[PDB]
Amino acid sequence: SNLIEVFVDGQSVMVEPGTTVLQACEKVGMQIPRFCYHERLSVAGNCRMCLVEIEKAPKVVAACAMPVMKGWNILTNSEKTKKAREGVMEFLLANHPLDCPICDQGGECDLQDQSMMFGSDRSRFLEGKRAVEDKNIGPLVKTIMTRCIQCTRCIRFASEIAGVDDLGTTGRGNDMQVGTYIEKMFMSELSGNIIDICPVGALTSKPYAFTARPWETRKTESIDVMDAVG
Amino acid sequence: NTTYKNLQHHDYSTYTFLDLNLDLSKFRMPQPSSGRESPRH
Amino acid sequence: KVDDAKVSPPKRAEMKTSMESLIHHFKLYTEGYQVPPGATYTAIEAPKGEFGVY
Amino acid sequence: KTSFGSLKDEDRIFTNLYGRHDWRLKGAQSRGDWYKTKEILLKGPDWILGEVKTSGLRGRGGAGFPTGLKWSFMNKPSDGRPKYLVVNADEGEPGTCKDREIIRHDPHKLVEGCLVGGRAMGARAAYIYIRGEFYNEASNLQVAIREAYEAGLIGKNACGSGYDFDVFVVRGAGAYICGEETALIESIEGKQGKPRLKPPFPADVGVFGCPTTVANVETVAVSPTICRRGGAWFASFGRERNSGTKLFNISGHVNNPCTVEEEMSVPLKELIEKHAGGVTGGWDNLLAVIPGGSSTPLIPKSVCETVLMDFDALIQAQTGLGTAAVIVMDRSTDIVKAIARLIEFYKHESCGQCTPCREGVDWMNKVMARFVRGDARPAEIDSLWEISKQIEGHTICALGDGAAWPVQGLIRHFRPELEERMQRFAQQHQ
Amino acid sequence: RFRGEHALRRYPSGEERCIACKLCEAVCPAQAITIEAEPRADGSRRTTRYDIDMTKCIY
Amino acid sequence: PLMGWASTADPLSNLVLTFSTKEDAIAFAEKNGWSYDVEERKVPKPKSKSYGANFSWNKRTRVSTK
Amino acid sequence: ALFVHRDTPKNNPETPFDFTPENYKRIEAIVKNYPEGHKAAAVLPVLDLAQRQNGWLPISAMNKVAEILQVPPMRVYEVATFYTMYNRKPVGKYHIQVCTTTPCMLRNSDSILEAIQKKLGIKVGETTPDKLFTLIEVECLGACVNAPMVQINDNYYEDLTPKDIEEIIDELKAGKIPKPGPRSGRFSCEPAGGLTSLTEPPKGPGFGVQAG
Numbered sequence A: 001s002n003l004i005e006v007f008v009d010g011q012s013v014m015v016e017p018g019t020t021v022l023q024a025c026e027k028v029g030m031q032i033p034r035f036c037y038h039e040r041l042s043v044a045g046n047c048r049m050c051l052v053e054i055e056k057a058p059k060v061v062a063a064c065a066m067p068v069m070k071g072w073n074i075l076t077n078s079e080k081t082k083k084a085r086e087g088v089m090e091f092l093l094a095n096h097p098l099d100c101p102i103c104d105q106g107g108e109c110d111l112q113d114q115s116m117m118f119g120s121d122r123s124r125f126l127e128g129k130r131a132v133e134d135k136n137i138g139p140l141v142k143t144i145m146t147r148c149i150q151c152t153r154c155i156r157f158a159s160e161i162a163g164v165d166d167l168g169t170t171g172r173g174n175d176m177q178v179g180t181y182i183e184k185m186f187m188s189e190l191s192g193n194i195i196d197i198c199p200v201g202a203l204t205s206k207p208y209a210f211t212a213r214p215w216e217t218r219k220t221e222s223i224d225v226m227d228a229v230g
Numbered sequence B: 001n002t003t004y005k006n007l008q009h010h011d012y013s014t015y016t017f018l019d020l021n022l023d024l025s026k027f028r029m030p031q032p033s034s035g036r037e038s039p040r041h
Numbered sequence C: 001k002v003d004d005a006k007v008s009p010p011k012r013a014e015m016k017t018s019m020e021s022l023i024h025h026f027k028l029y030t031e032g033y034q035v036p037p038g039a040t041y042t043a044i045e046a047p048k049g050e051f052g053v054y
Numbered sequence D: 001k002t003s004f005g006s007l008k009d010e011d012r013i014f015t016n017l018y019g020r021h022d023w024r025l026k027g028a029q030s031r032g033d034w035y036k037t038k039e040i041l042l043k044g045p046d047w048i049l050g051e052v053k054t055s056g057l058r059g060r061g062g063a064g065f066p067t068g069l070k071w072s073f074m075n076k077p078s079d080g081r082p083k084y085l086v087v088n089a090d091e092g093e094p095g096t097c098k099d100r101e102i103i104r105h106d107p108h109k110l111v112e113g114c115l116v117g118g119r120a121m122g123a124r125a126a127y128i129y130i131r132g133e134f135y136n137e138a139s140n141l142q143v144a145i146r147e148a149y150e151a152g153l154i155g156k157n158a159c160g161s162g163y164d165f166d167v168f169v170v171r172g173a174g175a176y177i178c179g180e181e182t183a184l185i186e187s188i189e190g191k192q193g194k195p196r197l198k199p200p201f202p203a204d205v206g207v208f209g210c211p212t213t214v215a216n217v218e219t220v221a222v223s224p225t226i227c228r229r230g231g232a233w234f235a236s237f238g239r240e241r242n243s244g245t246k247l248f249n250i251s252g253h254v255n256n257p258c259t260v261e262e263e264m265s266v267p268l269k270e271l272i273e274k275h276a277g278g279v280t281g282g283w284d285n286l287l288a289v290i291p292g293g294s295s296t297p298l299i300p301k302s303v304c305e306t307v308l309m310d311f312d313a314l315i316q317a318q319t320g321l322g323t324a325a326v327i328v329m330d331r332s333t334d335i336v337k338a339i340a341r342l343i344e345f346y347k348h349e350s351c352g353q354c355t356p357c358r359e360g361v362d363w364m365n366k367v368m369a370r371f372v373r374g375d376a377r378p379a380e381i382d383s384l385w386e387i388s389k390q391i392e393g394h395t396i397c398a399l400g401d402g403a404a405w406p407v408q409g410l411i412r413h414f415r416p417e418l419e420e421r422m423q424r425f426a427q428q429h430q
Numbered sequence E: 001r002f003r004g005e006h007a008l009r010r011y012p013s014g015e016e017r018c019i020a021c022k023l024c025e026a027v028c029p030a031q032a033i034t035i036e037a038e039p040r041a042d043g044s045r046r047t048t049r050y051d052i053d054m055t056k057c058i059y
Numbered sequence F: 001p002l003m004g005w006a007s008t009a010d011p012l013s014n015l016v017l018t019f020s021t022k023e024d025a026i027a028f029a030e031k032n033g034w035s036y037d038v039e040e041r042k043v044p045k046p047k048s049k050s051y052g053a054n055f056s057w058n059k060r061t062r063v064s065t066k
Numbered sequence G: 001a002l003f004v005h006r007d008t009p010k011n012n013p014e015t016p017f018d019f020t021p022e023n024y025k026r027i028e029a030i031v032k033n034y035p036e037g038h039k040a041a042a043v044l045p046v047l048d049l050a051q052r053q054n055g056w057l058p059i060s061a062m063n064k065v066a067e068i069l070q071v072p073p074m075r076v077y078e079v080a081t082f083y084t085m086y087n088r089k090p091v092g093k094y095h096i097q098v099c100t101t102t103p104c105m106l107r108n109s110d111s112i113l114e115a116i117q118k119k120l121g122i123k124v125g126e127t128t129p130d131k132l133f134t135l136i137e138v139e140c141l142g143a144c145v146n147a148p149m150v151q152i153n154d155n156y157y158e159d160l161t162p163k164d165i166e167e168i169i170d171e172l173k174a175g176k177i178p179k180p181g182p183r184s185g186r187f188s189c190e191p192a193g194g195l196t197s198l199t200e201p202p203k204g205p206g207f208g209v210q211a212g
């Protein structure tokens, strides 16, 4: 009754039809590394880190938005799977400059954890590393658009859930700037909920900005107050 | 025959395309609709 | 040192001109390199005897 | 079969390369267009599909996928949502011109081709996406559609038959990437030109949410003559799989570069010296050959002495065959400068969805600039081999692979010239 | 390469060399490094408190 | 007040215990005397989102910007 | 090159900008070609209508297009930043485009660049000290079959040489427009050798065609 067989590392599992490869691999416990995907946002194919080699298909296919035909064998630990991941991590670290001390999301970046646990060790490419003039989104959200990896996660959240429609891609090639063309404040509801969506340290909180880092501070359960939602 | 039977486009000015679009707009099937007229109406 | 930027931090010139050097430097001095789950014993010949670490 | 083939007249595909009789619905009717095609449309469109799949019409536009299997995928059972035919006419891959001359001289054969294609798959309208650079010939195509609707044989109750069908023109705005499969579709959607992911197919979800298809100018232009001419006798032109004619054009570097219709099987030496003037400096002067527009690795002299112009021999020569640039470049110039110019082109025209083509075209731009100035050690040329092994098969569209391949052409064939350029700059540094 | 005084540095005709990145606290094995950081109205990030226990320093 | 540190009368605040399953947490907390608050565990809720279902013909889910 | 707005008034809405009701009838034809339901897809033809109305576009043009096509304007800012036709800087009347990538540079485009330079006077990428001579070099226009090519406003020019370039610039100063085709004879894209192509006026539908 609506079941599809996928073989993840030889282990068979039945999956509801119409889902993705990534939901099956997370169902059996594997975390395929990802940037552009998020469970509350519609899928794009930008960030490319989701690659995985299905057997007998020589193109390594994206797994963030792969529909599930019947009877797969999905190998997350083959050779060219690892080579594709090392390659994409080798490409991302060019146009993202050295700021990991003065960054605000140093302790909980995504590039850093995935560059340890999946990436390379010795880079290439001597010159390069373009720079972008900073933006002024609003006085509640501090914005440096040089650390932006153009992951295209903020724009989909804006245009779907926020609907304020003041974020856009501009340009082509290496020169793709994410932001407002027209020098206008993005001051609305849930404008503060972009600083945790932005998976690199390019969008952060204004009054918190340069105080602490995610290892000294300790976590504690608490409740949303001043609201009825909780 | 070895003569350029074009050059009818010798002097098509920059509004001739849009005037011709107006010229060819009629006698046309009604461009089918689907529910809403826009996703934000 | 070793041929691996996931164990020892790289040296100064590459740290000042890379990206991966700064990333591995930063995470290697906050978190530290991960160690696979396992129980080992060894003991070497200290001059006092078998200095064992488990 | 055939003894390697050559040119033949009155079995040519389209008339009026330049300056023939007139430009008129009646002139095309006298030449052989618009001829009794209601009986073509009412014999049964599934017979047209069988005719296409039997004739072996190879697909064009830099893909090489067969036309017949694709349009057999284009026979979905009809829903309330209609189906659209989209004729691409964007003119990319420098060394380009395959359809400019056609769309200026005889657009009526394109109109009848998209009419036959729209009746073939149950489609309802043909959107013709022209590159925006082409105001003159676009207005000529507009006057062609004007005269077609003024004769009234297409439109509604078309060809005297109860089957309505319309033909529209949407202009481009200047991009290589609009010519692709699905960035085309979102360029029609009003969004900025960016492709979509391939396992959700444009034959399934397409123009705004209707199943549609996309074809080249040449395949749609030959498509009425496939119906009204001999099945498998069109396939008498060339080898077994790759069959029919193709517009082999020398655009570039000979005496008087130009365009000719030829068969599939044709010797490249005959193509060069017998159809476009002569070689500048003789056959000994030429350095190398590119086929395939510009999305194809180069071909040296010793390979092209024997390897004739065919798809199977070029894929076994690690190359893909396309249109209009089947050309030589001379020994007197810097092919390193030419390839770096091509990489600057692929930087200037590319979107930035996939991080691989963006970052890799950045690296290859800076590295090929440093190779024109000779500013490296051969670890870097092997590094360029590494990056072109990693970009290949990691993107959405084909522009990433098309940017990866000229690096592999340069490395696989002109290695010692790179070594000597680097040694020249080594002596300049030393 | 002796390890002595615990002195700071400053740029050539420039500013404080520390940018308050807490790595010295993250590697201080008796946690003598205590950092509390604040920025200023200029734009460049800074500190408030940078303290060392000379008891807990172990060199 | 001499430095600006954080001094506390909390010996036990630095403890944390890493367990495999909830049953042994219950058993260990009942064994070692002190009371305990069991808060429950919430799974990532499986949602059905896909590409061609996001870019349809008539549905209002249409990103209009990518 | 400066892909943020950066006002500099004579911009900075509301700039005075409006069309003709005749152009509104053109707009009704343009959104009559498209199917209803996805009405907002005419941003590119409407904005190109604005570009051929006013040769450069201000931001109030984009706001007017947002008024007509009832969408939030950020889509229009995306499209205006994306493509290459929409010259968002204020430039002059006539517009020189020197195309040069792969055949064009090896067919002596540098002599063409030097000819445009030492006759016009101003450096590449810039403009002139009036309107009507804005020079850019560009990538492939499509018409690869001949010399490194010149596009002026909806006009192609092939088979170049510096004396014909001086002719073209002199005729732009005199205002007279040249032909819409190449030079060196050959009224279309021709084999300039010995008629290697088809020669004879063809038969037509008369001979044996398979049931047609």
Ligand SMILES: Cc1cc2nc3c(=O)[nH]c(=O)nc-3n(C[C@H](O)[C@H](O)[C@H](O)COP(=O)(O)O)c2cc1C
Residues within 6 Å of the ligand: D059, D060, D061, D062, D063, D064, D065, D067, D088, D089, D090, D091, D092, D093, D176, D179, D180, D181, D214, D215, D216, D217, D219, D397, D398, D399, D402
């Ligand atoms: C990178 C790229 C560039 C393309 N350039 C062109 C082009 O210049 N002209 C064209 O008509 N089609 C072009 N196409 C589309 C091809 O014709 C492709 O085959 C098309 O999607 C389907 O056409 P077919 O019916 O020949 O298979 C291009 C496709 C890609 C992926």
Ligand code: SF4
Residues within 6 Å of the ligand: A096, A097, A098, A099, A100, A103, A104, A105, A106, A107, A109, A110, A111, A112, A147, A200, A201, A202
């Ligand atoms: S976003 Fe990540 S990689 Fe970039 S500076 Fe911040 S911590 Fe470093």
Ligand code: SF4
Residues within 6 Å of the ligand: A147, A148, A149, A150, A151, A152, A153, A154, A155, A178, A197, A198, A199, A200, A202, A203
């Ligand atoms: S600003 Fe952040 S969320 Fe938006 S594209 Fe850049 S990295 Fe992604």
Ligand code: SF4
Residues within 6 Å of the ligand: D177, D195, D350, D351, D352, D353, D354, D355, D357, D358, D395, D396, D397, D398, D399, D400
């Ligand atoms: S390969 Fe480059 S040009 Fe093609 S879709 Fe990806 S980002 Fe765009």
Ligand code: SF4
Residues within 6 Å of the ligand: E017, E018, E019, E020, E021, E022, E023, E024, E025, E035
């Ligand atoms: S916080 Fe510590 S490690 Fe970082 S710059 Fe300051 S003194 Fe150096």
Ligand code: SF4
Residues within 6 Å of the ligand: E024, E027, E028, E029, E030, E031, E032, E033, E052, E056, E057, E058, E059
């Ligand atoms: S104990 Fe002393 S030398 Fe060691 S890290 Fe701490 S402050 Fe530095």
Ligand code: FES
Residues within 6 Å of the ligand: A034, A035, A036, A037, A044, A045, A046, A047, A048, A049, A050, A051, A062, A063, A064, A065
């Ligand atoms: S997860 Fe981002 S590309 Fe598939």
Ligand code: FES
Residues within 6 Å of the ligand: D094, D095, D096, G099, G100, G101, G102, G103, G104, G139, G140, G141, G142, G143, G144, G145, G148, G149
């Ligand atoms: S490259 Fe100059 S016309 Fe195509």
